[PDB]
Symmetry: C2
Subunit: 470 residues, 2 copies
Amino acid sequence: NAMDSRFLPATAFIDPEGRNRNEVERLVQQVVDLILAKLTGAAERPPMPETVLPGPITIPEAAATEATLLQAIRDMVDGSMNPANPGYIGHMDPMPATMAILGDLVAAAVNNNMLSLEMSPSFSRLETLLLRAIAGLFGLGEQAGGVLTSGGSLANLQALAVARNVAFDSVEPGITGLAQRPVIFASEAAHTSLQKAAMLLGLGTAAVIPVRATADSRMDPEDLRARIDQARGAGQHPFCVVATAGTTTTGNIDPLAEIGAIAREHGLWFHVDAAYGGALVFSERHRWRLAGIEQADSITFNPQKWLYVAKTCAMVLFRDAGVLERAFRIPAFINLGEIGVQGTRHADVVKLWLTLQHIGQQGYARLIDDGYRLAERVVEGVRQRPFLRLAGEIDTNIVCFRGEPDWLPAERWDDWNAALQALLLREGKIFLSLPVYRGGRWLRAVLLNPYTTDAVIDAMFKQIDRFAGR
Amino acid sequence: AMDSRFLPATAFIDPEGRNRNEVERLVQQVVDLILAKLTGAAERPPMPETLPGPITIPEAAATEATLLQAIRDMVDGSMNPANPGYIGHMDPMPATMAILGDLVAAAVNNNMLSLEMSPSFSRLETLLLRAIAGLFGLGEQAGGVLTSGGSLANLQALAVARNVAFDSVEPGITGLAQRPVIFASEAAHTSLQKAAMLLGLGTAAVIPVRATADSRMDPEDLRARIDQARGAGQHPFCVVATAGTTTTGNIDPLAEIGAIAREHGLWFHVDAAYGGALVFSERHRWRLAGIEQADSITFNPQKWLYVAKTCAMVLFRDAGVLERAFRIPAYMRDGFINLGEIGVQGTRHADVVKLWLTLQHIGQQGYARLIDDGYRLAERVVEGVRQRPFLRLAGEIDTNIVCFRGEPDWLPAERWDDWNAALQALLLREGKIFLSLPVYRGGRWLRAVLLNPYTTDAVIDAMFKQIDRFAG
Ligand SMILES: [K+]
Ligand SMILES: [K+]
């Protein structure tokens, strides 16, 4: 009735008996052609878009023309960041695997819902089985399981929610009746989704007690021990320790076995935030760096980062999946909505499973090796240059470094590194990020793009030398 | 390393064109496969024909043929809301542009975490949500963020309400000596209880207000409960009204409930996850009267605006509240606020692309027409029920949702639940018609959600003929 009417475009929906197949096929092909053109041509667009500024938006009364829509897609693509450019080396945001793109097409077309088994009969079972398999690569044991979540922040929130619920039995009565303030410990280098989660969970941001990190940005276990004693002495109630496997700024890995041993000694939930570094489970050569992770009560891991799955794709894993029934699920197989922060949720398992199959464990082991190799080339270039300083030793394919030119007052180093970052981008078409770290602005390389080469790295250093020598 | 033996030729799209031909062919095969399933969706039943073994992640790359067969299997094993007989849930066939929008989003793979990771999309999302906040009538300060589902939008609205009432961003709420509570209809969404658990309030902090026979919140009982809460030494801080209850699709009286919230100094949140779409219908939008005074609104285009999941938002009448009462005191190099700092999520998929493309292609007039046709089908179901003395309506309808059940006099009330389950199974197996069967009022009820643009009077007629045959 609506679709026959003059108030809907003939291609607004796909007629399920094929009546508008030809019109629908031509519209789809125009969008597919445009996208393939932009992506097979991605190196023609710089890593960051040229500056334009947009006016107030209006939602039209009448249907837009296919022309207007295609032009909108064109402008949206041209105005977006372009991590497919070999020069894009700044963030844990990679070009997507081909199958990941196609898996989201497939997911959106069937439009199933992870909320319940009846709404995702194929997908729910697959996600549950795949995450058991992944939990097994982490060595979490037979009872281990998890859920997919829209982002690592939600995975951290859910881990901390469970750790809180187990410590305080807070599912039904909440935590406002408490005389001792609950607190958690994390490296001073750990992700701010811990503070955001602590605020959301009613613990407040201050409940995340920072633990000293070494010169190489790894948590100091002796300091963790100190801070736990201090918390107890102050009448606080520690309930969780978060170790990070791949810190956001520097990509370093905490000493997971030692941290875990301290958490267990003190009866604290041990959560490992392996959002980035968890991908090392696919590399024989580098997997040892995660040693201790197998004793975690929970793990956060984001395939959208180092496994090249188009955003979002992240999970939280529990060593005992049964805990979600005990200390999460509200009073009322298992409909996944009941045991996640989200209810309705897009079927990320489609792009995850298709991606994992097409690249394979050996494929990831090779991508990971090549990331390390580029990273080590950056480290060597920094070592050859007295005016550059490394943040510290690297644990992953991330290198944080900055200029500390001795001919400049330190008060002007932030300006110097900001200027270098802008120049690398403008003239070298190379994007580094510029995080705040240790109270200063540092440059940050994340060597993820499979098409970044040694030549790009040598090119960056050449322009750095030219900038340094004015 | 693409040059290596260890990765398929098409694992990634070479940014200088080197595998363009191979990538095009692979992409074309999946596109053609998906179009056949969707242009052929009426041949697949609304639900798949009826356990898988443990999964193994393969060492070596899978063949393109294995991958294609996986897609075929996954689709054939999926629910199929595109079937005209799928009429059971708030889960629609996706608009064509929403499918294509997600294709575009995944291809450029930007991140809504921050402006520099989503330079065009972050500004577009902020401006579009101001525009939508304006349609809801929230005023010039109104703004919002997209979220992955309405549960997160409800979570975020209730976090902000709690933070404003208790100054809890930094110290938390463990210090409190009177328990914070919220009020909501006994018909309201369970994401309130889940949100309450997450926020540290406990599931019991959601105090249920009596609803009428038509499943609408009773403003008099809300007042009683607020009085009772304060007498019991609780601290009310928020009232949630629901515009479109999940089971029956009813709309709370937003103006009266909001008057009562404002009278008692409580945050007024409207969960318009479903019914919010009425903002695009001149003819039905009056049903939301009072919503314009809300402190916050949850709205889910993935429901009645046909945007492929997920797509939802939380809107605030004063978007500055997010800076004041949400954002943490404080990885990247205008003054614009990175959206990750003012949402529950940090990294987020660019849902704005399918939303904006869909809104433009359907337009306000298209939605008004879609909504009308939904009310027409629902009214046809209501009429069918009225004619059959063995069927009972749950109550008056407010949206395109109809909850009803068999209560046949010739069977004892104790057997009604099994009668209705068996009818639901029958409609599905014989009729190829899917109705959901929620628990409501301690009973099993049938539930029709009349969303598919291709559901016709004839589908409804067939459902009633199967019901008649079953009852005879
Ligand atoms: K150096
Ligand atoms: K009747």
